Design a binder for this molecule. Structure first.
Ligand SMILES: *C/C=C(C)/C=C/C=C(C)/C=C/C1=C(C)CCCC1(C)C
Ligand code: NA
Ligand code: NA
Length: 137
């Protein structure tokens, strides 16, 4: 697969509920929904090595990983975690996260290239799923 691109959002679903499950308080959720519902995602892929930069006005992140090798990042609610990405299938990666400290909902994210040229991202907390869809700019 080639995930590389400057991806722009065309759909976002269920972000507020995700934050609610993660325990983000109502005022902070309002702020996040208003400001972080339209991320821009830059991906650079070389084989199974990835760089992903996600930009919103309230948080810019950059991660670097190799599929199958643990790395450190943060959950969507900003808690440090260990992460491990695997190929669920040829065109879909899945990242399982484990908090460095304390307890919380089980979190994960996925990225999937669709047959139409788009990118589906999901973020999960326990059973709740937030889905974003992107197309290259
Ligand atoms: C695809 C979904 C994305 C990139 C979600 C991003 C979420 C944020 C940048 C959330 C930020 C915040 C909180 C979770 C708590 C309060 C402080 C914020 C607004 C920076
Ligand atoms: Na590959
Ligand atoms: Na490996």
């Amino acid at each position: 697969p080639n995930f590389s691109g400057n991806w722009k959002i065309i759909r976002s679903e269920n972000f507020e509920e995700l934050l609610k499950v993660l325990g983000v308080n109502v005022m902070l959720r309002k702020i996040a929904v208003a400001a972080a519902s339209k991320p821009a995602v830059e991906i650079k892929q070389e084989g199974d090595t990835f760089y992903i930069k996600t930009s919103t006005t309230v948080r810019t992140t950059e991660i670097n990983f190799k599929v199958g090798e643990e790395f450190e990042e943060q959950t969507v609610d900003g808690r440090p975690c260990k992460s491990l990405v695997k190929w669920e299938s040829e065109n879909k990666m899945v990242c399982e996260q484990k908090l460095l400290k304390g307890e919380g909902p089980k979190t994960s994210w996925t990225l999937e290239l669709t047959n139409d040229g788009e990118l589906i991202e999901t973020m999960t907390a326990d059973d709740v799923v937030c889905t974003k869809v992107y197309v290259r700019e």
